[PDB]
Design a protein around this ligand. Structure first.
Ligand SMILES: [Cl-]
Ligand SMILES: [Cl-]
Lengths: 307, 309
């Protein structure tokens, strides 16, 4: 599979494919993604880190922005407390097999010239565009604060200062990335990953929301949380267990069953798993079992390294 | 008059008088005011500088914030160009008899810890409060920018960093100052000066052609601009010529007339001038003449002191 298609695999969109092809021709190119420090690193994070690894294997230099000041502007508590959580997150990412340069926002987002450019960009960005960009990012507030509208300008400015060719993030980042394309001299190529559904099945996977598989969860917690997960028979849309099968397991896949339920079963693609599950030829509990045991094996090297 | 009443004279309000009395008891206290560098320094500026001089005479150390970065955030062009205009403004203020420390915003408004506090204050200030505070300050924009709401937070943060007891400004600053009182550990006492009407009579005094008297204008420009000014007979409200009489002239005042129109008249207070003008016992042209000649005399010491350099 070529570089382009490796990068495209399991993304929701690329802005634009044509521009990505131009970036691939360069001898040196770079990609970044930002993570607000999180107490738990979960499959949400891991999906995006896998995408960064795809880019790394395609010749990109990778920058992970440990986005302490962004999270501070997004109301995540005190800044020194936001910094302690990021130190752990770094170790987890290294344990996932990513080799990258790690930058804390605070190392450069308070420098004189960075700040002056925030204000320069603030003169060019409408309140309406700033607020629009934060709808899927800002926490649900009845009295929105000025911090909401500084945040997107700071993300845009960070992309400018990083000098990257590609910016990666979730689909929730879409409008901030579009602003960056309008506001900056160099149009950044944007790769968006899908939003993983949480295990409760009623929103995104989140650390604050308690509906996550952490990459360092122990095997019994992986089993318990998968067993309890939303997984309606025949239904693929909004089904977090099928999403995990899609984005994390490897095919062909051997799903172990007792012989009384049909015996062990081989599935050559996600699309085939989808077909079996839609037709109720595979029951929730048995998908869950397979997904739990596979995820335990996939996450083992990460648990081992973290120690 | 005592210190309190000298300070109060010709102010629109004091937030609060009770707190100002407490500040007056301190051995050391300080006041600031911010000016976006302006190519013309006019009676608008001079009214406020006179107020800073009142505070200086009452024992306050004075800080004039030459607000280059505020003006930059308020769309006044390039920053180095905004800085050149401020250097001239400094000389004018010294020539008005003010002895004060002059601070450029850019010397401290980009420091790491200042900036961090802007963001800290941004987490506490509602968009609605920020926009409300800028209605009478922000330039006329069909697509209002994010800079509009950072600006008041930066003014608040400047007041915090200056460490001042009193913040002075026009009534247009009112809501930013109220935000400062809510946002900061130390409640700053706010003294607001009235907004001078422009000579056209259709907004505030600003560097619109023939809408200002500059403190360094030559005598013929002072006469021409006063002669042309909005000054409707009998009407004091919104009348820039009566405002100038109020806030700048000395009483008793001798207004010259020919004997056929009632002869020369002596006016011992502004209130007396007001009475005469409301009752049409003094005609616009004659008020104008007196106001022009008085202003030439009042501004003479400023012209003189600027002609040393
Ligand atoms: Cl089954
Ligand atoms: Cl008369």
């Amino acid at each position: 599979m070529d570089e382009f298609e490796l990068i495209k695999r399991n993304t929701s969109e690329i802005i634009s494919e044509e521009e990505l092809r131009e970036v691939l021709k360069k001898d040196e190119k770079s990609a970044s993604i930002g993570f607000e420090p999180s107490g738990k690193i979960h499959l949400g994070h891991y999906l995006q880190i896998k995408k960064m690894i795809d880019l790394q294997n395609a010749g990109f230099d990778i920058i992970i922005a440990l986005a302490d000041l962004m999270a501070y502007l997004n109301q995540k508590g005190e800044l020194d407390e936001i910094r302690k959580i990021g130190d752990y997150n770094k170790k987890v990412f290294e344990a996932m097999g990513l080799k990258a340069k790690y930058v804390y926002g605070s190392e450069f987002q308070l420098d004189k010239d960075y700040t002056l450019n925030v204000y320069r960009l603030a003169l060019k960005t409408t309140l309406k565009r700033a607020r629009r960009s934060m709808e899927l990012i800002a926490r649900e507030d009845e009295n929105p604060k000025v911090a909401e509208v500084i945040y997107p300008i700071m993300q845009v400015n960070s992309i400018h200062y990083e000098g990257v060719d590609v910016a990666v993030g979730g689909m929730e980042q879409r409008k901030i990335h579009m602003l960056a394309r309008e506001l900056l001299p160099k149009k950044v190529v944007c790769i968006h990953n899908p939003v993983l559904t949480g295990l409760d099945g009623e929103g995104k996977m989140s650390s604050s929301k308690g509906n996550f598989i952490a990459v360092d969860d122990s095997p019994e917690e992986i089993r318990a949380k998968i067993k309890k997960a939303y997984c309606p028979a025949g239904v693929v849309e909004g089904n977090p267990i099928m999403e995990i099968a899609k984005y994390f397991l490897e095919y062909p896949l051997t799903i172990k069953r007792p012989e009384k339920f049909g015996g062990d079963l081989t599935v050559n693609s996600y699309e085939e798993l989808e077909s079996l599950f839609k037709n109720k030829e595979l029951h929730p509990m048995r998908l869950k079992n397979a997904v739990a045991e596979e995820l335990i094996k996939i996450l083992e090297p990460i648990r081992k390294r973290l120690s």
